[PDB]
Amino acid sequence: PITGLVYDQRMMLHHNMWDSHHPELPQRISRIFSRHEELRLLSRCHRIPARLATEEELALCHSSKHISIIKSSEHMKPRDLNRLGDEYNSIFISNESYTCALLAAGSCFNSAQAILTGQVRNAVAIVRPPGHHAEKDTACGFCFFNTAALTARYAQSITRESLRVLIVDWDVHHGNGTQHIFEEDDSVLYISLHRYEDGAFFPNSEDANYDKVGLGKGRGYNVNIPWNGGKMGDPEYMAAFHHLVMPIAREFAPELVLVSAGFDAARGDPLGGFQVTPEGYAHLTHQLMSLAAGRVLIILEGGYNLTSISESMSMCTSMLLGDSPPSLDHLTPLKTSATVSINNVLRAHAPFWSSLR
Numbered sequence: 432p433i434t435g436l437v438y439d440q441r442m443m444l445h446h447n448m449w450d451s452h453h454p455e456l457p458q459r460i461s462r463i464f465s466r467h468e469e470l471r472l473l474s475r476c477h478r479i480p481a482r483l484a485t486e487e488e489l490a491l492c493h494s495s496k497h498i499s500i501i502k503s504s505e506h507m508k509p510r511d512l513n514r515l516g517d518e519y520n521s522i523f524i525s526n527e528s529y530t531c532a533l534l535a536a537g538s539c540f541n542s543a544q545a546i547l548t549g550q551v552r553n554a555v556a557i558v559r560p561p562g563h564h565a566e567k568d569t570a571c572g573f574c575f576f577n578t579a580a581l582t583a584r585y586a587q588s589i590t591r592e593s594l595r596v597l598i599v600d601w602d603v604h605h606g607n608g609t610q611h612i613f614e615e616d617d618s619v620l621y622i623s624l625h626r627y628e629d630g631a632f633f634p635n636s637e638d639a640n641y642d643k644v645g646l647g648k649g650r651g652y653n654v655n656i657p658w659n660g661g662k663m664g665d666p667e668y669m670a671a672f673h674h675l676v677m678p679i680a681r682e683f684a685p686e687l688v689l690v691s692a693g694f695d696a697a698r699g700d701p702l703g704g705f706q707v708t709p710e711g712y713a714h715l716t717h718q719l720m721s722l723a724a725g726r727v728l729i730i731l732e733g734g735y736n737l738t739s740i741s742e743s744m745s746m747c748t749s750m751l752l753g754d755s756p757p758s759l760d761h762l763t764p765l766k767t768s769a770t771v772s773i774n775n776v777l778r779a780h781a782p783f784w785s786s787l788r
């Protein structure tokens with residue numbers, strides 16, 4: 432009944448040298464860690480060490496060209512770093528960025544290994560830079576390497592190739608990189624909830640719509656839950672879990688659950704515009720703990736209100752430790768567009784998942 436936790440202050444070294452107030456701040460992870468200490472959650476966890484991902488491990492999901500370019504940034508001058516970052520969509524780079532991305536991935540590898548060998552029951556990874564926008568061949572949206580995708584492949588490499596991994600991505604943005612990496616794969620089920628606005632929300636692609644169900648062998652194994660026209664919160668997320676996430680996940684019967692746990696859908700976030708509460712994230716975590724014999728790894732993605740993300744992720748760790756869920760506020764009726772979204776996903780995925788029929 433042990434919960435693992437990985438945090439390493441070295442991941443704060445990745446920084447924006449032209450805009451020191453950029454929202455993807457070094458103190459995102461130190462604030463989450465501090466709140467775990469304040470709530471006396473840290474002493475209840477087993478500390479898991481960070482490590483660098485190797486280049487061979489990065490190649491589980493990424494091209495050699497992309498790996499080499501980010502690797503080369505470690506020795507670049509600021510003028511090189513500025514121009515290189517501006518080649519990507521929403522990326523800043525410093526001489527420490529590559530090392531920090533390696534530590535984010537390697538920290539999650541060690542956590543998955545601890546879960547899969549039974550050292551811990553579940554775990555939380557307080558890591559940055561985030562990962563779920565990173566593609567096979569390019570960086571994007573503050574992400575260099577796709578930490579969650581890499582962890583799924585790493586998990587398969589130390590168990591068996593066809594280990595069933597569920598990735599639930601509740602960051603407010605679509606994890607375009609994770610979807611693309613696994614789009615043709617039936618061993619990794621990707622489920623994303625995200626603000627969509629008919630494509631008028633980052634990353635601004637109709638790839639995030641509900642009709643993208645996967646390709647080839649992966650048909651049915653990509654579940655997009657897109658939100659339109661509404662300040663979504665606990666009622667909508669609870670409804671999506673009840674009607675979609677949990678029935679599909681139970682039928683898939685994962686052997687490992689990875690959460691791309693961005694907290695930018697949280698009330699107070701400067702970018703997301705949603706109002707999921709810390710108790711809401713607690714309830715989402717508690718439901719996922721009923722899968723995979725409790726083998727859940729919570730990986731920090733986005734989330735930019737330091738107070739909101741600290742309370743929200745700490746509440747997730749409280750759930751992993753076995754604490755009872757806090758009480759939700761009175762769940763208001765769903766925003767009408769959320770009902771439309773959920774019904775659209777149900778129709779798209781009922782062909783592949785008999786639990787939705």
Ligand SMILES: O=C(NO)C1=CCCC1
Pocket residue numbers: 521561564572573602603604633693695702732733734
């Ligand atoms: O939080 C994020 N992704 O999860 C952001 C990347 C670019 C703008 C917002």
Ligand SMILES: [K+]
Pocket residue numbers: 600601602603604605606623624625
């Ligand atoms: K998401």
Ligand SMILES: [K+]
Pocket residue numbers: 613614615616617619620621645649652653
């Ligand atoms: K998939």
Ligand SMILES: [Zn+2]
Pocket residue numbers: 602603604693695732733734
């Ligand atoms: Zn995000």
